Point group: C3
Chain length 167, copies 3
């Protein structure tokens, strides 16, 4: 009475059965292979906000390499960040950028965990480098946490952030 | 007489044909896209064993970021490692850890080759950094090889290992 | 009159319907999972050519870790590179290598953008490190651009290039 059907990502049109493919994730060249969508390298300014250990903000020059469903951030501060404590929480919210924002949004899978972030900066003429960690707290906002290299009030500069997300 | 059938990863149930999907590798949102499984960041201690150029062992504080089927290791020694030669082979066996061990096991594809490992440590107050290489020698055990920065007996400290595996 | 058919990467043979799979990209273990093809670590010499800011060339010792459809380059110069300007364009053409060249060729998706490249070198005894960028200009040729750390004629040495491509 009832025959045979196909559930997504399989679909049918005029009795032709197909694989629906996310071009950012895969594609066919006779077989199923990796993504066919253009990579892009976006460059923009992102104003990060201290949210604990600081109420200052900081301009970061960002390069985002969106390639397949991997997106890698390479960022640089301009100007200084005022820090109050010895650890600082620094927040990146998509609003504060100045564009398919899509491929700057982590998949729900990725958001489940804290992720590695490479951080360095200068504090009164000494360089500091730390293995730090980021966490998304909503799909549009993540926060990195790293030590500031001392106590009480100071101004760090030449802040670099290297990280990546699965979108 | 004989009709039409479907081979894995295609399967059928009540005449509904499906793509069986590894959630750590892909998933559907109408189309075939990347993984839907939660990422996790595990933190644990791994005791590495010198196996040549040393018979000492060394506590490493490990963070493993298991995200999709990529797993990235960021590790730090505590205490010192006694080295005898000028290259050392350092072994990471899953037993020596203190948990889905699954996503700390490389795919058979990955094991076929030696893989890049970032290493640095301090030796009598000088820092040393090397591009080193790891090789799995069984699915549960890999060995990194790196130079020790001198000869005969010494103690290196602040050992860091940054690497990653395809699981 | 006309029934039902299957378009690639779906195919059929003796009324058995299949997923055609790129083994460098995926495979089945009951479900669709990631690649099954061996990783390999190739080691060879690549002669890069200055193409602007220099007409010199430079031997690089290359290690390429081809794993799945990701290929990561770790390279080192031997000898010195003569630089004339304050930025230099350095070109890597597959001809100049001395082997499935296949997995050293970026997918068309990847070529669409400039990509991040890590570079450092020494210039009259000071170390220099820069976040640089590469661009393929044909599927067999890419060019990195980085600053040389000064002006007019000099010789840089101990040049390292760390980058990666989606193949």
């Amino acid at each position: 009475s009832h025959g045979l059907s196909f559930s997504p990502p399989l679909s049918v049109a005029d009795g032709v059965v197909s694989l629906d493919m996310d071009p950012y994730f895969c594609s066919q060249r006779v077989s199923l292979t990796s993504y066919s969508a253009e990579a892009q390298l976006m460059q923009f300014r992102w104003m990060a906000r201290g949210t604990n250990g600081s109420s200052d903000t900081i301009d970061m020059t960002v390069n985002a390499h969106c390639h397949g469903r991997r997106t890698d951030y390479m960022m640089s501060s301009t100007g200084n960040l005022t820090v109050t404590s010895n650890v600082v929480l620094l927040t990146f919210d998509l609003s504060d950028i100045t564009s398919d924002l899509a491929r700057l949004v982590p998949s729900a899978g990725f958001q489940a965990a804290s992720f590695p972030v490479d951080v360095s900066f200068t504090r009164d003429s000494a360089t500091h480098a730390y293995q730090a960690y980021g966490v998304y707290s909503s799909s549009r906002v993540f926060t990195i946490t790293f030590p500031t290299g001392g106590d009480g009030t100071a101004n760090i500069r030449s802040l670099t952030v290297r990280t990546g997300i699965d979108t």
